[PDB]
Amino acid sequence: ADLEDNMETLNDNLKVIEKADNAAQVKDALTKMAAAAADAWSATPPKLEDKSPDSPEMHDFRHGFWILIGQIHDALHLANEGKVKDAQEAAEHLKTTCNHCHQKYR
Amino acid sequence: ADLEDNMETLNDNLKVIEKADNAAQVKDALTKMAAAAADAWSATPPKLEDKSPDSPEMHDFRHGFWILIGQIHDALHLANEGKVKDAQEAAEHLKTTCNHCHQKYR
Amino acid sequence: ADLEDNMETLNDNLKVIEKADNAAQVKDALTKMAAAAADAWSATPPKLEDKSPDSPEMHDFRHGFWILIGQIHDALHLANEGKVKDAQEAAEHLKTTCNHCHQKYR
């Protein structure tokens, strides 16, 4: 998918997690987020279209996805241990990584 | 790209790291390894084609890629820090993650 | 090496990072913060004095220090690659983790 569609997948699944009843709903949504983040990895965003892939700016852009992917990994372990509310709350904290990238690169 | 071509990218760049004679060659190889691992995320290997996408087997397959991606992240920081031989040596330790997934799933 | 004193060390060194002129001051403060977090890992907080060491609350308490330690680790790598303003801004983001534990257990 393109970068726009992977971002819509991240936004919509965050909302499904906040309104979940059960563990099954939370796990499935985190798995969809992990796939979207991994597919987005080598996208060039509009703001950096004149830069090389090996520039400081593109190395920094990719660093944001490493962090996001790490956080989704941990939240999914919480959900699979039966700590559903702890997983929802970790999902709420992911938003600061979202905002950090957007303020520099969007 | 498909799974077999992602694996050939991982294998070539591990050899570049070993024969490297400057820091730039090591940084560039690790970056290519990270891109290939993120692109492999979503693949279904031949041996698990008769399982569901949400099967315990496929969840465990994907967990191996989370582990590899995390180890590459740390190796790249070491290289950028000036600790280049330490980065090469950490790259050699990646082999046990490669071997673990192959024994279970290849 | 009691909990109160480890917390003073966390708070003091965060202010140092916020006011620093140079990269040496940031690296030293981050290293002191990691020491204090590792030293706090095994403490029993006053609010959980009545609980089993194996309770869900105490497992969760310890998990919070693992999260803080991982974030400090990343910020120090950024400082060591010359991305000093980025390490400073990352140190500021630590406050979300500080306050998440405080709201549950302080």
Added chain:
Amino acid sequence: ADLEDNMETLNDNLKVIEKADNAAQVKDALTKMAAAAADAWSATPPKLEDKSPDSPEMHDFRHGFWILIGQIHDALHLANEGKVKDAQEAAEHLKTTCNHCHQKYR
């Protein structure tokens, strides 16, 4: 505890995991290993006792404990999701991290 007692705790609980009869034994042993690793973090080993705390060797020594602590963290999550065999096999893999530090500093 001193460094020698922390290493005896690490060695003993690794054999406990290998020979475990049930899941509770594996979780307990991992939690004890994490405590010992966190307590060892600030120790000065005999081979480095004459160099300064800011030396590259002490920085590097401490980094190896961060790596060990992260691997125990992931293995405890696997045990708590019910993947206890996988947690046992992950614990076996820790040995290469133990051996790497011993090769360099013991």
